[PDB]
Structure formats: structure tokens, C-alpha cells
Write a protein that binds this ligand. Structure first.
Ligand SMILES: CC1(C)Nc2nc(N)[nH]c(=O)c2N=C1CNCCN1CCC(SC[C@H]2O[C@@H](n3cnc4c(N)ncnc43)[C@H](O)[C@@H]2O)CC1
Length: 154
């Protein structure tokens, strides 16, 4: 299954944190990285007085169950992390899990607010411009409907 994962961090200098998170993702059992987007520098969604965020997206091929992947992404956040409107040491958000639809206590997939976040959508569109959501919406169509500002690269 191909899972799309959003990565964010606004440690003053988040490159090393993001690279470490990516290595950890690639080390998850029964999983490997297919593609990584460019690194993007985005203004805080929240109080404008914290550092800019580094946002990216990753396509991860995996045989894990969705909640098993979430267990690994949560583990990685704890191991490299340390709030509400930021700053954020490391966030890993499951955007899509193949074509699955999940609405549990622990997991909402597709991700419950990605439709409203250009810093999630634009990096995904880079690595998966043809993506269709489980409900038949097209990523390209969402960006075209909303006209979110394009992102600057890190
Ligand atoms: C401060 C803010 C709004 N401003 C930002 N400004 C820019 N520019 N860039 C950013 O990047 C950016 N980020 C954020 C904060 N994003 C945290 C998103 N995230 C919340 C959900 C979970 S943290 C709470 C809970 O969400 C549950 N969850 C439900 N669905 C999912 C799912 N699909 N993926 C993961 N967790 C799931 C999970 O059980 C967890 O306990 C992990 C992290």
C-alpha cells in the first residue's frame, strides 16, 4: 500500500530533524520510501512569532496496517520530538493510506484537515499530481478550486 505522509517542523533549524525523521520512516518494518517532495519553507499557521516551518511530503510503500503505521509515526515523533499552535519539533501526519477510508478514535484518513492546508497539499501535488481521493475528489481539483498560494522552497 502507498501511504502519503506529511512532515512538519519549526525548530529554528529543522533540516536535521526532518532528515532524521526521514531516515526513521525508511527504517519502519515492512516499509520503504518511494518518493520525497522538496522541502518547503512556510509561514506559521498560528502566532506569527515562531519560526517558519519546514514542510514536505513522503510517499511510503508499506505492508503495515494503518494503525500499525500510526504506531510507528507516533513512536518517531516521541523519539525525536518534545504546542497547540506551535512551535512543533516534529509532526508526522498520515494524509492518505492507499484508497482506504478510516474514521476511528485514533485515525482519520484522509487526514481531517489537509483540504484546508496548502502546506500539506502543495508538497503532495509535487510527488503525486494525479492523486484521486477515495471519494473521487482530485488533488489537482482541490488546488484549482481553492487557489492556495504556492510555496517557497526551503
Ligand atoms: C501549528 C500548526 C497548526 N501550524 C503549522 N504551520 C505550518 N506552516 N506548517 C505546519 O506543518 C503546521 N503544523 C501545525 C500543527 N500540525 C500538527 C498536525 N498533527 C496533528 C494530529 C496528530 S496529533 C493528535 C492526534 O491526531 C490523531 N490522528 C487522527 N488522524 C491522524 C492522522 N491521519 N495522522 C496522524 N495523527 C492522526 C492521532 O491519534 C493523534 O493522537 C499529529 C500532528
Amino acid at each position: 500500500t502507498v501511504a502519503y505522509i506529511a512532515i512538519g517542523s519549526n525548530l529554528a533549524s529543522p533540516l536535521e530533524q526532518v532528515n532524521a525523521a526521514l531516515k526513521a520512516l525508511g527504517d519502519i518494518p515492512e516499509s520503504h520510501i518511494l518518493t520525497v517532495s522538496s522541502f518547503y519553507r512556510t509561514p506559521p499557521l498560528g502566532p506569527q512569532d515562531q519560526p517558519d516551518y519546514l514542510n514536505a511530503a513522503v510517499a511510503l510503500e508499506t505492508s503495515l496496517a494503518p494503525e500499525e503505521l500510526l504506531n510507528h509515526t507516533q513512536r518517531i515523533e516521541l523519539q525525536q520530538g518534545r504546542e497547540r499552535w506551535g512551535p512543533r519539533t516534529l509532526d508526522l501526519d498520515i494524509m492518505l493510506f492507499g484508497n482506504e477510508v478510516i474514521n476511528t478514535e485514533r485515525l482519520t484518513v484522509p487526514h481531517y484537515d489537509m483540504k484546508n492546508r496548502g502546506f500539506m497539499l502543495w508538497p503532495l501535488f509535487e510527488i503525486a499530481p494525479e492523486l484521486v481521493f477515495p471519494d473521487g475528489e482530485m488533488l489537482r481539483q482541490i488546488l484549482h478550486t481553492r487557489a492556495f498560494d504556492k510555496l517557497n522552497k526551503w
